[PDB]
Design an enzyme around this catalytic site. Structure first.
Site, PDB file in Angstrom:
ATOM      1  N   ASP A 197       0.921  -1.136   0.000  1.00 28.61           N
ATOM      2  CA  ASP A 197       0.000   0.000   0.000  1.00 28.61           C
ATOM      3  C   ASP A 197       0.964   1.188   0.000  1.00 28.61           C
ATOM      4  OD1 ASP A 197      -1.359   2.319   0.897  1.00 28.61           O
ATOM      5  OD2 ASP A 197      -2.868   1.096   1.914  1.00 28.61           O
ATOM      6  N   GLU A 233      -0.032  -0.165  -4.464  1.00 22.79           N
ATOM      7  CA  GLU A 233      -1.392   0.313  -4.628  1.00 22.79           C
ATOM      8  C   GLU A 233      -1.452   1.781  -4.251  1.00 22.79           C
ATOM      9  OE1 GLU A 233      -4.999  -1.773  -3.469  1.00 22.79           O
ATOM     10  OE2 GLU A 233      -5.508  -0.090  -2.153  1.00 22.79           O
TER      11      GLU A 233
END
Ligand SMILES: [Ca+2]
Ligand SMILES: [Ca+2]
Length: 488
Positions: A197, A233
Site C-alpha cells: 500500500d 497500490e
C-alpha cells in the site's frame, strides 16, 4: 531477473485446502501449482501465469490478515514456514515468481508493539506509533466508517483506516529499520518481492515528499539481499500514481484504466477507454518515460465487486474485458476466480468466496464460509469441458502473451477500429501488431490497407477469412471476438 509477467492474486483462505479443515492453505497451493503454471511453455494445460501474489499470510486475528500481530510468523490457518519454503521452491521450479502482501503501513491493535506502547507512555515502543496533541477532527466518506484519532488508555493514537489498525510512525528511524528488517527476512526465505500500500497517512501534508524518500530507501536496502519486484497500490488519478514508478516501485495498479475498461465493455462503445488510455499512458510517458515503468493493468481486485457483476453478469462482456486488459502493456494481474467467471458483490467476504474447483463438493475445495453465490454457478470442472470456455479463453490469451513478449514491453497506440470496437497497435522495432476487440453481440467489420497481413490470433472458434476489394482487406469479426493481425 525477469520482472515482466502475468500475475495471479490468491486469497490463500479460499484457494485449496490440503488437510480437510475447510481453510485454504499453502500446501494446497503447492498441490494445485500446475493449474497456474506447469513449467512447460509448450503446453496450454495451465493458465501460464509467471507470478503469484499471496494476500496477507502473517499471524492475524481476522480472516483477511491486513491487521498483523506477528510479522515473523505464518498464520497457522495457512500452514507453516516449512510449507512456505516448499511453495517458493515448487513455484521457482516452474518459473513462477512469488510476492506477498506486506501490511507495514499499520499493525493490528493486538500487535505486541502496540499493546506495550498503548499501556505505558514511557514504553520503548511508544514512538513506534503516532500520538495526538491538537485537534481530533475526522474526515469522512468512503466505505468503512470515520475518524482517524482513537482512544487508548494512555492517550489517543492515529489510525487512518480503523482503531484496530494503528499506523506505524515512519518519522521514527527505528520503525523504518524494523520494517526493512522484516522485508529482508522474507526475501531470505525465498520471496521475490512484495505487494504494498503506497499511501502513508502518518506523514503530515507538509511531509508528502518523505513518502518517496521512504520507498526509495526501502527498495535500495532490500535489494542488498537480491533483485526484487515491487508493485504498489495508489488509489488515485494517474498524475498522483506516476511518481511512484520513479521512487522504488516497478509497478503500480492502474485503477483508473480498470474503470475505463469496465465502462467500455459494459456500454459497447470504445470512446471511454480510448480517451482514458491515451491520457494515462501520456501521463506516465511524460513524467517517467516509456520503458521506465511496468504498468499493472487489471479489471477488479480483492476490494471490489467482481468484474462479472459489474458487467451485469454477462459472461460474453467479461470475455471481451479479459481480452482487452490481457493485450495491454505491462504486467496484467488476474484476481483468483476471475478466469472461471466467479461472481460476487457487496461485502468483501462475498468477493472473497471459496474458489470453485468442482460442480458439487470435493476434497480440497474450501468452505470456511458458505459459497452462497458460486456454489453451482461455475467451477473449474465445468470450464474444463469445452475448449472454448472462459477458462480456456484466459489460457489462450496468457500463453499468446508469453509467446509474443512485445505485449509486455512494446509501445501502444490507440487506433480507430470502428463504432463498437476497441483497437490498438502493440509494437516495437521488430513487431507491428494490430489488435481488434469486438465489444458487441453482433459481427463488425474492420478494414486495413492492402498489403502483407497475417492473422496471428482468433479468440473464437469460427473461421475468419478476409476479403479484398478496392485495395482494402476486410475482416468480419464475430460477436465479442478478438483478433490480432501482424503487418509486415
Ligand atoms: Ca486447510
Ligand atoms: Ca504450460
Amino acid at each position: 531477473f525477469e520482472k515482466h509477467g502475468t500475475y495471479y492474486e490468491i486469497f490463500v483462505r479460499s484457494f485449496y485446502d490440503s488437510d480437510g479443515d475447510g481453510i485454504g492453505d499453502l500446501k494446497g497451493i503447492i498441490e494445485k501449482l500446475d493449474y497456474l503454471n506447469d513449467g512447460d511453455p509448450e503446453t496450454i494445460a495451465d493458465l501460464g501465469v509467471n507470478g503469484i501474489w499471496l494476500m496477507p499470510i502473517f499471524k492475524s486475528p481476522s480472516y483477511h490478515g491486513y491487521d498483523v500481530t506477528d510479522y515473523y510468523k505464518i498464520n497457522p490457518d495457512y500452514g507453516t514456514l516449512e510449507d512456505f519454503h516448499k511453495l517458493v521452491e515448487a513455484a521457482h521450479q516452474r518459473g513462477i515468481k512469488v510476492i506477498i502482501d506486506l501490511p507495514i503501513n499499520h499493525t493490528s491493535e493486538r500487535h505486541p508493539w502496540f499493546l506495550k506502547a498503548s499501556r505505558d507512555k514511557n514504553s520503548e515502543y511508544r514512538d513506534y506509533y503516532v500520538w495526538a496533541g491538537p485537534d481530533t477532527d475526522t474526515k469522512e466518506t468512503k466505505l468503512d466508517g470515520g475518524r482517524v484519532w482513537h482512544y487508548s488508555p494512555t492517550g489517543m493514537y492515529y489510525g487512518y483506516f480503523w482503531s484496530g489498525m494503528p499506523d506505524l510512525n515512519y518519522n521514527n528511524p527505528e520503525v523504518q529499520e524494523k520494517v526493512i528488517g522484516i522485508a529482508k527476512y522474507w526475501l531470505k526465505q525465498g520471496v521475490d518481492g512484495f505487494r504494498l500500500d503506497g499511501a502513508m497517512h502518518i506523514f503530515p501534508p507538509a511531509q508528502y515528499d518523505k513518502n518517496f524518500t521512504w520507498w526509495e530507501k526501502f527498495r535500495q536496502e532490500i535489494e542488498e539481499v537480491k533483485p526484487v519486484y515491487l508493485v504498489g497500490e495508489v488509489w488515485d488519478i494517474s498524475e498522483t500514481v506516476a511518481p511512484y514508478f520513479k521512487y522504488g516501485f516497478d509497478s503500480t495498479f492502474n485503477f483508473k484504466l480498470a474503470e475505463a475498461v469496465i465502462a467500455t465493455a459494459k456500454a459497447g462503445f470504445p470512446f471511454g477507454f480510448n480517451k482514458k488510455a491515451k491520457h494515462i499512458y501520456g501521463v506516465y510517458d511524460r513524467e517517467v518515460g516509456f520503458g521506465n515503468y511496468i504498468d499493472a493493468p487489471f479489471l477488479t481486485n480483492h476490494d471490489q465487486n467482481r468484474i462479472l457483476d459489474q458487467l451485469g453478469q454477462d459472461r460474453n462482456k467479461a470475455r471481451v474485458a479479459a481480452s482487452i486488459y490481457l493485450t495491454l502493456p505491462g504486467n496484467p494481474f488476474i484476481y483468483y476466480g476471475e478466469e472461471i467467471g466467479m461472481r460476487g458483490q457487496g461485502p468483501h467476504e462475498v468477493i472473497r468466496e471459496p474458489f470453485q474447483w468442482y460442480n458439487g463438493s470435493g476434497e480440497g475445495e474450501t468452505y470456511w464460509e458458505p459459497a452462497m453465490y458460486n456454489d453451482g454457478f461455475t467451477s473449474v470442472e465445468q470450464e474444463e469441458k469445452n475448449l472454448d470456455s472462459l477458462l480456456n479463453h484466459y489460457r489462450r490469451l496468457i500463453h499468446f502473451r508469453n509467446e509474443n513478449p512485445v505485449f509486455y514491453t512494446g509501445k501502444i497506440e490507440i487506433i480507430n477500429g470502428g463504432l463498437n470496437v476497441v483497437a490498438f497497435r502493440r509494437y516495437n522495432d521488430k513487431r507491428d501488431l494490430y489488435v481488434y476487440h469486438n465489444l458487441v453481440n453482433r459481427p463488425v467489420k474492420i478494414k486495413v490497407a492492402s498489403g502483407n497481413w497475417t492473422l496471428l490470433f482468433n479468440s473464437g472458434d469460427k473461421e475468419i477469412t478476409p476479403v479484398e476489394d478496392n485495395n482494402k482487406l476486410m475482416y468480419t469479426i464475430p460477436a465479442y471476438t478478438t483478433i490480432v493481425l501482424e503487418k509486415e
